[PDB]
Amino acid sequence: ASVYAWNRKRISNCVADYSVLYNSASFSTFKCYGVSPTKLNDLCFTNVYADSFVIRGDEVRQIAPGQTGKIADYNYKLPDDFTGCVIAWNSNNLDSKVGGNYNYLYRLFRKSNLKPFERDISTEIYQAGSTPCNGVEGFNCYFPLQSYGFQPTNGVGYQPYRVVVLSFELLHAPATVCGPKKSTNLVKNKCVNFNFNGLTGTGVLTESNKKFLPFQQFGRDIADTTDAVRDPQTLEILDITPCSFGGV
Amino acid sequence: NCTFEYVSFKNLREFVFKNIDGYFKIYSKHTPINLVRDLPQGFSALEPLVDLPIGINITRFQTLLALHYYVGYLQPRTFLLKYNENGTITDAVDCALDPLSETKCTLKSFTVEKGIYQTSNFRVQPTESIVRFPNITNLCPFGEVFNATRFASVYAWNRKRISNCVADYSVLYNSASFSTFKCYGVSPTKLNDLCFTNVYA
Amino acid sequence: VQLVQSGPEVKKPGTSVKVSCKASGFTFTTSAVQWVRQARGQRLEWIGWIVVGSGNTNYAQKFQERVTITRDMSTTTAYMELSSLRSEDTAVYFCAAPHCNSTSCYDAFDIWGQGTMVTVSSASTKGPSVFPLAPSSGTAALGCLVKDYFPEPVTVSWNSGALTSGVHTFPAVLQSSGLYSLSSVVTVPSSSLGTQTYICNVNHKPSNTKVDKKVEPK
Amino acid sequence: DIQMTQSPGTLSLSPGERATLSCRASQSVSSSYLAWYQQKPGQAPRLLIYGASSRATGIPDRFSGSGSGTDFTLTISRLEPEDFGVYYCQQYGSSPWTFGQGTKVEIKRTVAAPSVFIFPPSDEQLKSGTASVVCLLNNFYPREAKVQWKVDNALQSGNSQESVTEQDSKDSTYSLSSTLTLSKADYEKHKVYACEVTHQGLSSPVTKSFNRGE
Ligand SMILES: *[C@@H]1O[C@H](CO[C@@H]2O[C@@H](C)[C@@H](O)[C@@H](O)[C@@H]2O)[C@@H](O[C@@H]2O[C@H](CO)[C@@H](O)[C@H](O)[C@H]2NC(C)=O)[C@H](O)[C@H]1NC(C)=O
Ligand SMILES: *[C@@H]1O[C@H](CO)[C@@H](O[C@@H]2O[C@H](CO)[C@@H](O)[C@H](O)[C@H]2NC(C)=O)[C@H](O)[C@H]1NC(C)=O
Ligand SMILES: *[C@@H]1O[C@H](CO)[C@@H](O)[C@H](O)[C@H]1NC(C)=O
Ligand SMILES: *[C@@H]1O[C@H](CO)[C@@H](O)[C@H](O)[C@H]1NC(C)=O
Ligand SMILES: *[C@@H]1O[C@H](CO)[C@@H](O)[C@H](O)[C@H]1NC(C)=O
Q: Please, what's the b/e burial string for C56-71 (b: 16 or more CB within 10 A of its CB; e: otherwise)?
A: eebbbeebeeebbbeb
- Which residues neighbour B118 within 8 Å (Cβ) at sequence distance 6 or greater? none
Q: Do domains D4-107 and D115-211 have the same CATH topology?
A: yes
Number of residue pairs across A and B with CB atoms under 8 Å?
45
Pairing of strands A160-168, A218-220: unpaired
Chain A closest-CA separation from residue C53 CA (Å)? 7
Task: Judge: B47–A120 Cβ closer than 8 Å, yes or no.
Answer: no
Which amino acid, one-letter code, is at C44?
A: L
B131 contacts: CB under 8 Å, gap ≥ 6: none
CA closest to C75 among chain B residues: B171
Is B84 touching ligand 3 by the criterion CB < 6 Å?
no
- Residue C80: how many other CB atoms lie within 10 Å: 26
- Partners of residue D53 in chain A, C-beta under 8 Å: none
Three-class DSSP category at D124: helix
Cα D118 to Cα A144: distance, rounded to the nearest angstrom? 67
Distance CA A54, CA A52 (A): 7
The C-alpha atoms of residue C186 and residue A154 are separated, in whole angstroms, by 63
Distance A123 CA to ligand 3 centre (A): 9
For residues A224 and D10, what is the distance between their CA atoms, to the nearest angstrom? 88
CATH topology of domain D4-107: Immunoglobulin-like (2.60.40)
Longest dimension (CA), chain B: 91
CATH fold of D115-211? Immunoglobulin-like (2.60.40)
**CB of D160 closer than 8 Å to CB of D177:** no
Residues B6-24 as b/e (b if ≥16 CB within 10 A, e otherwise) read eeeeeebeeeeeebebbbb
Backbone angles phi, psi at A60, to 5 degrees: -65, -30
Q: What Rg, from alpha-carbon coordinates, does chain A have?
A: 24
Amino acid identity for residue D56 in this structure:
A
- Tell whether D93 lies on the interface with A, counting CB pairs under 8 A: yes
D82 three-class SS: helix
CA B131 to chain centre: 24
Name the residue ranges covered by the structural domains of chain D. 4-107, 115-211
Nearest-CA distance from B111 to chain A in Å? 19
Distance CA A173, CA A176 (A): 9
Cα(A8)–Cα(A6) distance, integer angstroms: 7
Nearest of B164, B172, B163 to residue B191 by alpha carbon = B172
Experimental method: cryo-EM
- State the Cα–Cα distance between residues A111 and A124, nearest whole angstrom: 12
CA contacts within 13 A on the Cβ side of B128: 2
- Answer for the pair A81, B20: CB distance below 8 angstroms, yes or no: no
Torsion angles phi and psi, residue A151, rounded to 5? -125, 150
- C116 and C135 in a single domain? The answer is no
Q: State the amino acid at position B63 in one-letter form.
A: T
Question: Given its phi and psi angles, is residue B168 left (phi above 0), alpha (psi -120 to 50 degrees) or beta?
Answer: beta
Which ligand gives the minimal distance to the CA of B174?
5
List Cα–Cα distances, C16 to C34, C84, D182, in angstroms: 19, 6, 37
Cβ-in-10-Å burial (0-12, 13-18, 19+) of C77 comes to middle
**Is D138 within 8 Å of C141 when comparing Cβ atoms?**
yes
Total of domains in chain C: 2
Look up residue A192 and give its DSSP letter: E
Question: Is D in contact with A (3 or more beta carbon pairs below 8 Å)?
Answer: yes
DSSP D191: -
- With touching defined as 3 or more inter-chain CB pairs under 8 Å, the answer for chains C and B is yes
Instruction: Indicate if C94 and C30 belong to the same structural domain.
Output: yes
3-state secondary structure B101-158: HHHHHHCCCCCCCCCCCCCCCCCCCCCCCCCCCCCCCCCCCHHHHHCCCCCCCCCCCC
Q: Smallest Cα–Cα separation from A56: which of A91, A102, A8, A16?
A: A91
DSSP secondary structure string for all residues of A47-78: -EEEEEEEEEGGGGGGSSTT--SHHHHHT---
From the centroid of its chain, how far is CA D133? Answer: 23
What distance in Å separates the CA atoms of residue A64 and residue A55, rounded to the nearest whole number? 14
Q: Which of C54, C86, C120 is the last residue of a domain?
A: C120
D54 near A CB under 8 A: no
Question: SS3 of D32, please?
Answer: helix
Q: Which residues of D118-135 are buried (b: 16+ CB within 10 A; e: fewer)?
A: bbbbbeebbeeebbbbbb
CATH code (residue C12): 2.60.40.10
Set of chain B residues whose Cβ sits within 8 Å of the Cβ of C25? 137
Strand extents, DSSP E, A83-236? 84-90, 105-107, 126-127, 141-142, 145-147, 160-168, 191-196, 199-207, 218-220, 226-230
Domain boundary pick from C92, C120, C148: C120
Whole-angstrom Cα distance, residue D12 to residue D38? 17
The strand pair at D19-29 and D63-76 is best described as antiparallel
Return all residues near B84 (Cβ < 8 A) that are at least 6 apart.
B90
Between the CA of C104 and the centroid of ligand 1 the distance, in Å, is 7
| Dist. CA B61–CA A132, nearest whole Å | 26
**D32–A139 C-beta distance less than 8 A:** no
Give partners of A (≥3 CB pairs < 8 A).
B, C, D
Q: How many other CB atoms sit within 10 Å of the CB of residue A36?
A: 9
Check pocket membership of A114 for ligand 2, CB cut-off 6 A: yes
The residue among D131, D105, D109 whose CA lies nearest residue D120 is D131
Same-domain pairing of C116 and C133? no
Cα-to-centroid distance, C75 and ligand 5 (Å): 7
Instruction: Give dist(CA A61, CA A157) in Å, integer.
Output: 11
- Helical spans, DSSP H, in A41-157: 70-74, 92-95
Neighbour-count burial of B197, counting CB atoms closer than 10 A to its CB (0-12 exposed, 13-18 middle, 19+ buried): exposed
In terms of domains, do C36 and C79 share one? yes
The C-alpha of C32 sits at a distance from chain A's nearest C-alpha, in angstroms, of 8
C-alpha C148 chain-centroid distance: 18
The verdict on the CB of residue B137 being under 6 Å from ligand 4 is: no
In chain A, residues with a C-beta closer than 8 Å to the C-beta of C57 are: none
Helix (H, G, I), strand (E, B) or coil at A128: coil
- Is ligand 4 within 6 A of the CB of residue B86? yes
CA distances to C34, C47, D121, D133, D136 from D180, rounded to whole Å, are: 42, 37, 10, 5, 12
**D177 and C CB contact within 8 Å:** yes
Q: Give the residue numbers in A contacting B (CB under 8 Å), as ranges.
A: 8, 10, 49, 57-58, 68-69, 79, 115-121, 155, 157-158, 210-213, 215-216, 219
Residue D187 burial (CB < 10 Å; 0-12/13-18/19+)? buried
CA distances from A213 to A190, A217, A218, A219, D191 (A): 26, 8, 10, 11, 123
Which of C59, C90, C120 is the C-terminal boundary of a domain? C120
Query: Which residue of A131, A140, A141, A148 to mutate against C (max C Cβ within 10 Å)?
Result: A140
> How many whole angstroms from its chain centre is CA C181?
16
* C173 and C200 within one domain: yes
- Pocket of ligand 5 contains residue B146 by CB under 6 Å: yes
CA distance C74 to chain B (A): 7
Prior bond of B48 cis (ω within 30°): no
Q: Which residues of D touch C129 (CB under 8 A)?
A: 125, 128
Do A111 and C51 lie within an 8 Å CB cutoff?
A: no
Please list every residue in chain A whose beta carbon sits closer than 8 Å to the beta carbon of residue D93.
138-139
Task: Determine if residue B147 is left, alpha or beta; phi over 0 gives left, psi from -120 to 50 gives alpha, anything else beta.
Answer: alpha
Q: CA angle A75-A78-A83, nearest 5°?
A: 150
Please give the angle made by the CA atoms of A56, A59 and A64, to the nearest 5 degrees: 135
Strands D103-107 and D10-13, bridge-based pairing:
parallel
Q: Are D112 and D20 in contact (CB under 8 A)?
A: no
Beta bridge partners of residue C169, listed in sequence order: C184
Q: Which residue range is the domain that position C144 belongs to?
A: 129-215
Rounded Cα distance, A54 and A57, in Å: 10
- Return phi, psi of residue D79, to 5°: -75, 125
Q: Does A149 touch chain C (CB under 8 A)?
A: no
Ligand 5 atom showing the smallest separation from residue B143 Cα: 14
3-state secondary structure of D188: helix
**Residue count (chain C):** 218
The number of the ligand nearest the C-alpha atom of B142 reads 5
**Strand C209-215 versus strand D34-39 pairing type:** unpaired
**CA-proximal residue: ligand 1, atom 10 (nearest):** C106
* Cβ A117 vs Cβ A103: under 8 Å: no
Rounded to 5°, angle at Cα A221 from A219 and A225: 80
For residues C40 and C113, state if they share a domain: yes
Taking the centre of ligand 4 as the mean of its atom positions, its distance from the CA of residue A189, in whole angstroms, is 25
Secondary structure (3-state) at D128 = coil
Based on the domain organization, do C111 and C173 belong to the same domain? no
Q: One-letter amino acid identity for B56?
A: I
Q: Which of A119, A120, A123 to mutate to test the pocket of ligand 3 (most atoms within 8 A of CB)?
A: A123
Q: For chain D, what's the residue count?
A: 214
Q: Are B46 and B16 in contact (CB under 8 A)?
A: yes
Q: For the beta carbon of residue C199, count every other beta carbon within 10 angstroms.
A: 16
Chains C, A in contact, 3 or more Cβ pairs below 8 Å: yes
Which of C53, C103, C105 comes nearest A111 by C-beta?
C103
**Chain C contact present for A176, CB below 8 A:** no
- What's phi and psi for A221, nearest 5 deg? -95, -175
Phi/psi region, residue C48 (left: phi>0; alpha: psi -120 to 50; beta: rest), is left
What is the number of the ligand 5 atom nearest to the C-alpha of B142? 14
Tell me how far apart the alpha carbons of residues D206 and D114 are, in angstroms, rounded to a whole number: 9
| Segment (H or E) for A20 | helix A19-22
3-state SS, one letter per residue, for chain C: CCEEECCCEEECCCCCEEEEEEECCCCHHHCEEEEEEECCCCCCEEEEEEECCCCCEEECHHHCCCEEEEEECCCCEEEEEECCCCHHHCEEEEEEECCECCCCECCCCCEECCCEEEEECCCCCECCEEEEECCCCCEEEEEEEEEEEECCCCEEEEHHHCECCCEEECCCEECCCCCEEEEEEEEEEHHHHCCCCEEEEEEEHHHCEEEEEEECCC
Our mutation pick for probing the ligand 2 site, out of A112, A114, A120, A122, counting the most ligand atoms within 8 A of Cβ, is: A112
Nearest CA in chain C to A113: C103
Q: DSSP string covering chain B, please?
A: ----------EEEEEEEEEETTEEEEEEEEEE---SSSPPPS--PPEEEEEE--------------------------EEEEE-TTS-EEEEEETTS-HHHHHHHHTT-S-PPSS--------PPP--------S-----THHHHHS-S-PPPSTT----EE-S----THHHHT-TT-S----SSS-SSTTSS---S-EE-
Total residues found in chain B within this entry: 201
Q: Report yes or no: C141 and C185 within 8 Å, Cβ to Cβ.
A: yes
DSSP state of D75: E
State in Å, rounded, how far the first CA of chain D is from the last one: 60
Determine phi and psi for B142, rounding to 5 degrees: -55, -35
| End-to-end Cα, chain A, rounded Å | 65
Give the separation between CA C162 and CA A161, rounded to whole angstroms.
69
Q: Which of C6, C22, C74, C111 to mutate to test the interface with B (most CBs of B within 10 A)?
A: C74
| Edge-to-edge order in the sheet of strand D4-7 | D4-7, D19-29, D63-76
C70 within 8 A of C52, measured Cβ to Cβ: no
CB C131 within 8 A of CB C65: no
- Is A226 within 8 Å of A240 (Cβ atoms)? yes
Partner-chain residue, chosen from A129, A131, A142, that has the shortest CB–CB distance to C54? A142
Q: Which amino acid is at C78?
A: A
Round to whole Å and give the CA distance between D197 and D208: 8
The whole-angstrom separation of Cα D175 and Cα D196 is 15
Q: Is residue C16 less than 8 Å (CB to CB) from chain A?
A: no
Phi and psi for C88 in degrees, rounded to 5?
A: -65, -25
* CA A113 to centroid of ligand 3, rounded, Å: 22
- Tell me, using a 6 A CB cutoff, whether residue B111 lines ligand 3: no
B137 contacts in chain C (CB < 8 Å): 1, 25
Secondary structure element (H or E) that encloses residue D186, with its range:
helix D184-188
Alpha-carbon distance of D104 to D88, in angstroms, equals: 9
Residues C135 and C113 in one domain: no
Please name the residues between 109 and 168 in chain C that touch chain D, using a CB distance below 8 Å.
Answer: 109-110, 112-115, 129, 131-136, 139-141, 143, 145, 147, 168
Helix (H) or strand (E) holding D107: strand D103-107
CA C187 to chain centre: 28
